[PDB]
Amino acid sequence: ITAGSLFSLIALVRIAFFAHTSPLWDDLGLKKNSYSFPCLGPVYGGTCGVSIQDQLWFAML
Amino acid sequence: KPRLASLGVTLGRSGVRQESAKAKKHYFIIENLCVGCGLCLDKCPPKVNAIGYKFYGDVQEGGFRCYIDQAACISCSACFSGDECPSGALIEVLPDGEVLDFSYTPPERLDFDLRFLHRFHRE
Amino acid sequence: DVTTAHSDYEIVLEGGSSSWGKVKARAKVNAPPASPLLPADCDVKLNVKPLDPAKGFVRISAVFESIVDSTKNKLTIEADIANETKERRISVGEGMVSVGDFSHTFSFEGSVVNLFYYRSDAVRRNVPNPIYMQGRQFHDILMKVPLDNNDLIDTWEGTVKAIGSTGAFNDWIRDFWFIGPAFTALNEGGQRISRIEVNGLNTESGPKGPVGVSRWRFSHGGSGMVDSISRWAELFPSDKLNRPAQVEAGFRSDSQGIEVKVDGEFPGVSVDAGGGLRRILNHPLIPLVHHGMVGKFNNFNVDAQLKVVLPKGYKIRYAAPQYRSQNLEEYRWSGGAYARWVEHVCKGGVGQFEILYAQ
Amino acid sequence: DVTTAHSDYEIVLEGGSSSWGKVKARAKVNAPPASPLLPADCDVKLNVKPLDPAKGFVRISAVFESIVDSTKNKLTIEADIANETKERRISVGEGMVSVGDFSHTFSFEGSVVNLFYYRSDAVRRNVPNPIYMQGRQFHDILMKVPLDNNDLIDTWEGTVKAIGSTGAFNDWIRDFWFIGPAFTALNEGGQRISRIEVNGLNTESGPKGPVGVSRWRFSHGGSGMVDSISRWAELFPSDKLNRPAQVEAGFRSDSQGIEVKVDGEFPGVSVDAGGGLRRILNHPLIPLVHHGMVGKFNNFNVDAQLKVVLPKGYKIRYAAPQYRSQNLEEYRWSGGAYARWVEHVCKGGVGQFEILYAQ
Amino acid sequence: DVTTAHSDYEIVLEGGSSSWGKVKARAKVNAPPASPLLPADCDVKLNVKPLDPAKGFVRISAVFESIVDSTKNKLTIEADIANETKERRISVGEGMVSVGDFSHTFSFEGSVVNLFYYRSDAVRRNVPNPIYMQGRQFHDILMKVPLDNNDLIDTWEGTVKAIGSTGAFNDWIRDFWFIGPAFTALNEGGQRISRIEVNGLNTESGPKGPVGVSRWRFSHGGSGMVDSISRWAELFPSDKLNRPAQVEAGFRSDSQGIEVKVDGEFPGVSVDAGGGLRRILNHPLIPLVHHGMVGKFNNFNVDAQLKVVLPKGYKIRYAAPQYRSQNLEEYRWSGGAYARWVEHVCKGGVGQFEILYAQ
Amino acid sequence: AVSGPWSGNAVHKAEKYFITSAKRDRDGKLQIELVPASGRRKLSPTPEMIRRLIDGEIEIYILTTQPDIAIDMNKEIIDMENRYGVKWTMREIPVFYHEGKGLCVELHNKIYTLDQFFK
Numbered sequence A: 001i002t003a004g005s006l007f008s009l010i011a012l013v014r015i016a017f018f019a020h021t022s023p024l025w026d027d028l029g030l031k032k033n034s035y036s037f038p039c040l041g042p043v044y045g046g047t048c049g050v051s052i053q054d055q056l057w058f059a060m061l
Numbered sequence B: 001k002p003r004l005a006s007l008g009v010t011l012g013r014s015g016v017r018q019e020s021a022k023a024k025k026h027y028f029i030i031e032n033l034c035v036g037c038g039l040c041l042d043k044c045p046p047k048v049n050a051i052g053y054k055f056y057g058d059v060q061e062g063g064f065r066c067y068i069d070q071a072a073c074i075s076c077s078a079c080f081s082g083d084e085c086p087s088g089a090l091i092e093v094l095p096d097g098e099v100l101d102f103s104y105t106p107p108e109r110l111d112f113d114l115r116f117l118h119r120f121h122r123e
Numbered sequence C, D, E: 001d002v003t004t005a006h007s008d009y010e011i012v013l014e015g016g017s018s019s020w021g022k023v024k025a026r027a028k029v030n031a032p033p034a035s036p037l038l039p040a041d042c043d044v045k046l047n048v049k050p051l052d053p054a055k056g057f058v059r060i061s062a063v064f065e066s067i068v069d070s071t072k073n074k075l076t077i078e079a080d081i082a083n084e085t086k087e088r089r090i091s092v093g094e095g096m097v098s099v100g101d102f103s104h105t106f107s108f109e110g111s112v113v114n115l116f117y118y119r120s121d122a123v124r125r126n127v128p129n130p131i132y133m134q135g136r137q138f139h140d141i142l143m144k145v146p147l148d149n150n151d152l153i154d155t156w157e158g159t160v161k162a163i164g165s166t167g168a169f170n171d172w173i174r175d176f177w178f179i180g181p182a183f184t185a186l187n188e189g190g191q192r193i194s195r196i197e198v199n200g201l202n203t204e205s206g207p208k209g210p211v212g213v214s215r216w217r218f219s220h221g222g223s224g225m226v227d228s229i230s231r232w233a234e235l236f237p238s239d240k241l242n243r244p245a246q247v248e249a250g251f252r253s254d255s256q257g258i259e260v261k262v263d264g265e266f267p268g269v270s271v272d273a274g275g276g277l278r279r280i281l282n283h284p285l286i287p288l289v290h291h292g293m294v295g296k297f298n299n300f301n302v303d304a305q306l307k308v309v310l311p312k313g314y315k316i317r318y319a320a321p322q323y324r325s326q327n328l329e330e331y332r333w334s335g336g337a338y339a340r341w342v343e344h345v346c347k348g349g350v351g352q353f354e355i356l357y358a359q
Numbered sequence F: 001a002v003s004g005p006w007s008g009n010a011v012h013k014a015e016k017y018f019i020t021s022a023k024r025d026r027d028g029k030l031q032i033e034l035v036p037a038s039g040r041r042k043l044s045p046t047p048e049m050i051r052r053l054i055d056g057e058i059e060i061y062i063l064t065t066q067p068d069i070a071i072d073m074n075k076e077i078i079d080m081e082n083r084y085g086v087k088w089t090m091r092e093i094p095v096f097y098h099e100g101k102g103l104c105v106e107l108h109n110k111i112y113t114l115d116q117f118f119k
């Protein structure tokens, strides 16, 4: 349970801290305009599942 | 003490019912900034196929970008209006020439963290 | 046991280049007014009709119907103000002043000149929204009051005698012109009233009866706070007066409190803010600084709702304080930050509340 | 441990043409005084004992016994004020000023002239109870002080030297005269202090020793707010002074708060209001406007009781705010609206509270 | 409706003849600032280094880094102030003023003269701790701004033209020098700004480019409230500057609230009080009177803690308001009387809080 | 140092300005106006605002669709694209400070000056 909480907490700390920008996207010069945007496309090896709605899914999963 | 005709103002505790309680501007892609996500392309009306794709390599290596065809663009400002662009490539030039990268920009600030001499956040 | 005040606001704006907005405001307050005579009630009416587009002239009317301690008081004004140049603005008008059984009429030929101590490009460049602009205003006045009453004659005879015998008339007239607390209002808004200058005090015959005539000229300077000086071009949207504009308001006051009703359309409610974005006109500073003078006498609780209605396709890009709720085209402000800003500005604060709405 | 202040008031009036009323006031406040030095305590005594009916001359005395930051401070005045005309009023008196081990006496021959910028019949006819009266006052002063101490001698010279070497002495003397926040108070009550004029600064020998003699003149104008100008006839009921009248008050102040004790009889408490109706004298505006200056620094809850006692056969025709309770002849005010008006006027508000009592 | 503000204070003092004290202050407030532009942030830095003991000269620096409504604003000053005599004090310094893309540098040669209207021995003998001292200050200014920008030249040309064509330039310049609410602050602290006097406005060539030069001189008088005049000797502990002293502070402000941080050591924090007893320096009156101007717009609850640390062997003889708790040599103030005095002085009150600590 | 993502635009690491018009005066001096990415104020490249560029507080760029860029940018841009929709490509050239000439554009391995670069 301790490991199972800290695991899904990672997806929650990311919703709280990276809703608009992250250290990586400030580096890649990008803005998370939206909460339900799927990916930015194939670019940078791809960036799928980066919105907070997707981070919500990875907390439920 | 005479007075003027009464003002009907029932705002507080009152038994009265309350009330319900042109091609001027131009748009462009900065190609070095674009990541080709195509969010702009889907805001363009399908009978005005202004935004389009341009390929020159593998997509996983930024091999594709978007661009507005000005010959068919009608300056409806749908791509810019919705704050779709995540990189700033989609920009707008006003009829007198200012370049806007985003529809509204937050104001600049200094930055410092406030601590306290004797509270929980000490020093 | 605890005082409370309730209020409702509403602004409806059109799209395109139109600066036209409809404003409605209802307020109800439970504390006594600072007026040393009660009850005092008052209704005001303003109507502006464009005479001709090329000239830029407009006809403005004003009616004041106020009963003060059972004393009927009425002031009526009809004038023709037009833009001569960027700093000069001439007005020709007539009006009537009635108190109880007394009344007297007047005709005036006047021009107002407005100059800014400096006009620098760097300010303009470095500033997107300038609030304070330092300046001064000069009024040329030619008053024409017929001496019909026995009292008018005596007020005129006395005035001429006073000028003749007292050297300090230009200075001590400012103690009369601003009666009771209006004089303290001068220092409060950072406004300096210069000494009046009497060009002439000559009696000229009129078909009705002898007409005392005064030709005077004065000046007054604003540290930047004064809106007449800082905003000279914005308070006269004559050229934007495509159709007639009217502002109608009134209020009731006594020991129990104040009831106020305000409504009317006029241009200039919306002004360009840069980058294709529109914005509600900056709040006038003089009214806030002038209300902090009477609004700091009773601890009160604020219940204010500000309903703003925007044009089709027009949404807000930014507002602080942020709207509590949005409902389709209309956006609502109530509670939280906004009912702190209302308590701020009802006590004399001038803190900025900005709404930017772009198409 | 809450800002709370308790107060008690009392007015007893006689019948007939008598304007005589007894006033008692006690107050208790829990916030620190806006005084850079504490503790500061003070007792004041005023006695007016009439001299002859035909002349209209009266003898007024004043004693000030205040300890400021352990420094005993005394000021004593004995004067003979009489009515010369409607605008002139001459006073002859003597007094002594003691601070710690220092003391000096003075004798003065003075006259005050009071003129209203206008006097119109229409204002009198159409306004039954006017509050705001624009005017100016002129003081003629002949000060005479015996210089029997080294410290007094040094002050006498420096002044002459300063006048001789500084052209701006008439202007910069206003800065020294209104010590601390007293100067700020000038703008606050809409009162303008004009430049003093030194008729003469001559040393004249006296039997005791060299005596400094000064003969100066000054003026000051009121926008209407000032009670000395607006109410010149009402602050000197000399002719109504059949028996000696005395007002006695005192106060204790420190970090913990203020306790005030005031009591005394004098005429002018009741004035005719028209239509056979009497009325309590309009509240002085200067004290309220002057207390809003220090009363706006600590939030508080009011606990004030105002007991008013009327003459036999004399019942109120109207009061706002209305008396909470009525024990027949004696009426009581406490709570509700009245507590709302006390918080209003203790913070600088000047809202009207009128009582009309007819036989 | 009440908001909350949290603050912490700290004063550490050394023993012997040392006047050195360390002061730290943190504050956090939840009401909107009175500034009509938000957000407005600001960081200030002051450093004073002694150049030579015999001369008494010291080098003072000041940096201002403020962003106002997204407009970067910076002012830099480097000056050499020294004590010439009891009333004269000459300063030689250079600085830079940058707003957005605009910047201009300046060099000044200046002297300030401070005189007290009177200097009596009796006041000194009978009053152990005087607060109000009546006085006036005179500034001699020789500004040297190079006209590098197109805008500078135009501001200078315009200035010369204005002087040439307007007789009232000495008077109306005070409406520009004190912009917006700054004009109102003058009357508030009982401070009179006299008319400026232009000795000369001459363009003198410099190696870089034409240098507009201004040689002006002005004066200003304090009724006693002003600390620059009343305390001229205390605000410059040059001779007590054995080691460098620095005061560092900054603040963040917007619609939501204000965050302030202040820290630094300097001499003069402790001054002799008589009878072998030391005492914390009397609170400056001008800051309190100036903050009552913006601190009276929102009802607030006070949460302030004042930790005072004394030298070994040094124990308080007396404090009002009394310290809530004590920890050996450290004494604490919080709550009760102290959080009434804070509510008092944050709204403009100047009530005395005195601490006497003897060895 | 640098402001956070929350202050101003988040994508930017330093404030961004775009030279929007390069008209010339009667004397032939190049009047350069650069507006920021937000775009609500007009500035000229004064020493105080160049001084920011030395420390990287701001960055300046020019669009290739500018009405008066003088140099035939489209032909050169079209050639490079063909080397490795081609027409409508737009780019942002990063203006840099050369102490000897002021603002220069390193276009195609050849330094240029704003006056040389613009019409």
Ligand code: BCL
Binding pocket: C046, C047, C048, C060, C062, C077, C079, C081, C088, C089, C090, C091, C093, C108, C109, C110, C111, C112, C139, C140, C141, C177, C220, C228, C235, C236, C245, C246, C247, C265, C266
């Ligand atoms: C209040 C601040 C200023 C002031 C501000 C201005 C302004 C601003 C201007 C005038 C100008 C004039 N002034 Mg002036 N004026 C002041 C003091 C005076 C005094 C005086 C008794 O001391 C006098 C005699 C005058 C005389 C005059 C006239 C010669 C002239 C036209 C007045 C008019 O038609 O009003 C009409 C009569 C009324 C009762 C109107 C009152 C309107 C109020 C003040 C605001 C209402 C507008 C509301 C906020 C928005 C309404 C929109 C609707 C479409 C109307 N001024 C003070 C010092 N004055 C005008 C000019 O330039 O002439 C060439 C003009 O534009």
Ligand code: BCL
Binding pocket: D046, D047, D048, D060, D062, D077, D079, D081, D088, D089, D090, D091, D093, D108, D109, D110, D111, D112, D139, D140, D141, D220, D228, D235, D236, D245, D246, D247, D265, D266
């Ligand atoms: C405060 C507002 C006015 C003011 C208001 C008046 C009024 C009103 C008049 C005087 C008049 C006089 N004034 Mg004056 N006077 C002011 C400033 C000054 C200053 C000064 C230090 O600047 C000086 C030297 C003088 C000098 C003088 C005297 C020559 C003369 C008589 C004074 C006296 O006997 O007081 C006595 C000494 C005292 C300490 C009394 C203080 C009384 C206080 C102010 C009010 C107490 C009454 C209380 C509310 C009700 C009490 C009822 C009891 C029956 C007493 N004035 C200011 C500017 N002055 C008088 C005159 O006309 O002479 C011909 C007079 O009627």
Ligand code: BCL
Binding pocket: E046, E047, E048, E060, E062, E077, E079, E081, E088, E089, E090, E091, E093, E108, E109, E110, E111, E112, E139, E140, E141, E177, E220, E228, E235, E236, E245, E246, E247, E265, E266
């Ligand atoms: C604010 C009240 C007074 C004022 C108070 C004083 C005082 C006091 C004196 C000066 C003196 C001077 N004044 Mg002055 N001065 C005022 C208005 C002006 C104006 C103006 C714009 O109107 C000008 C141009 C000047 C010009 C000048 C200079 C010629 C000279 C040195 C200034 C300096 O180095 O500042 C340095 C630049 C700064 C930004 C410093 C600001 C400091 C603030 C005000 C207080 C900081 C101290 C803090 C509370 C404690 C810090 C301890 C640390 C060890 C520093 N004054 C007003 C009217 N002025 C000085 C003199 O005598 O020269 C011979 C001096 O001692």
Ligand code: BCL
Binding pocket: C005, C006, C007, C027, C028, C029, C031, C032, C033, C034, C035, C040, C177, C178, C179, C182, C251, C253, C258, C260, C291, C294, C295, C296, C297, C298, C299, C300, C346
């Ligand atoms: C306790 C805190 C209360 C509060 C306490 C009070 C109190 C107490 C009082 C008011 C008063 C007023 N309040 Mg408030 N008020 C509150 C909140 C509000 C709210 C709201 C919730 O939005 C509103 C709409 C109001 C509205 C008002 C007005 C009805 C009124 C001031 C009238 C005015 O503008 O005179 C404008 C006045 C003038 C223009 C001056 C006229 C005279 C001078 C001499 C003219 C010189 C100008 C010159 C001639 C002009 C130009 C001429 C032309 C150019 C020709 N209050 C808060 C919640 N308010 C005051 C009042 O008057 O009540 C009756 C008052 O005493």
Ligand code: BCL
Binding pocket: D005, D006, D007, D027, D028, D029, D031, D032, D033, D034, D035, D040, D177, D178, D179, D182, D251, D253, D258, D260, D291, D294, D295, D296, D297, D298, D299, D300, D346
């Ligand atoms: C928090 C809100 C509190 C409050 C907060 C405070 C605070 C805080 C303070 C007071 C102060 C005072 N309060 Mg309060 N006060 C409250 C309610 C009350 C009530 C009540 C409940 O009815 C009363 C009776 C009082 C009474 C008083 C007085 C004891 C005192 C002002 C003294 C005065 O008149 O000086 C009159 C002063 C003068 C006349 C000026 C003297 C000096 C000048 C230079 C003289 C020039 C005049 C000239 C020479 C005159 C004429 C000369 C003659 C003509 C010859 N307060 C409310 C509830 N009050 C203040 C005080 O002084 O406390 C000690 C103060 O700091």
Ligand code: BCL
Binding pocket: E005, E006, E007, E027, E028, E029, E031, E032, E033, E034, E035, E040, E177, E178, E179, E182, E251, E253, E258, E260, E291, E294, E295, E296, E297, E298, E299, E300, E346
């Ligand atoms: C609701 C009640 C709130 C409150 C409400 C507010 C509000 C509301 C505001 C402030 C503001 C301020 N508050 Mg407060 N405040 C509270 C309590 C506090 C406490 C605390 C708990 O101890 C602190 C530390 C502060 C601190 C502060 C500052 C950050 C700020 C004023 C800055 C300043 O000094 O400008 C000093 C200013 C100047 C020196 C003037 C500069 C301009 C003029 C023209 C210069 C002329 C001088 C001349 C040139 C000088 C000399 C030159 C040299 C001699 C050379 N507040 C209480 C609890 N406060 C105000 C602010 O500015 O916020 C941003 C504001 O609006």
Ligand code: BCL
Binding pocket: D035, D036, D037, D040, D041, D042, D064, D065, D066, D068, D073, D074, D075, D077, D095, D097, D098, D099, D106, D107, D108, D110, D141, D143, D176, D177, D178, D179, E123, E127, E129, E130, E131, E132, E133, E134
């Ligand atoms: C609630 C506030 C406290 C108070 C708070 C303070 C504080 C705080 C301080 C002083 C200080 C002073 N106090 Mg104390 N003081 C109080 C009451 C008094 C009384 C008294 C008998 O009540 C006296 C005589 C004094 C005396 C004085 C002075 C020694 C000194 C100011 C120096 C100065 O320049 O003044 C000289 C006189 C004047 C400047 C004004 C002239 C007097 C008035 C304006 C006119 C008197 C007219 C009188 C009625 C005579 C009749 C007039 C006739 C026509 C002749 N205070 C009240 C009760 N006082 C200050 C100090 O100690 O500095 C050394 C200071 O910091």
Ligand code: SF4
Binding pocket: A038, A039, A040, A041, A042, A046, A047, A048, A049
């Ligand atoms: S998540 Fe993967 S497959 Fe889906 S759009 Fe993004 S890059 Fe393409």
Ligand code: SF4
Binding pocket: B027, B043, B044, B045, B048, B050, B051, B068, B073, B074, B075, B076, B077, B078, B079, B080
């Ligand atoms: S303005 Fe309209 S048509 Fe043109 S590119 Fe944008 S969305 Fe497409």
Ligand code: SF4
Binding pocket: B029, B030, B033, B034, B035, B036, B037, B038, B039, B040, B041, B065, B066, B084, B085, B086, B087, B088, B089, B090
């Ligand atoms: S939305 Fe932005 S990143 Fe996506 S294709 Fe358009 S310009 Fe490129």
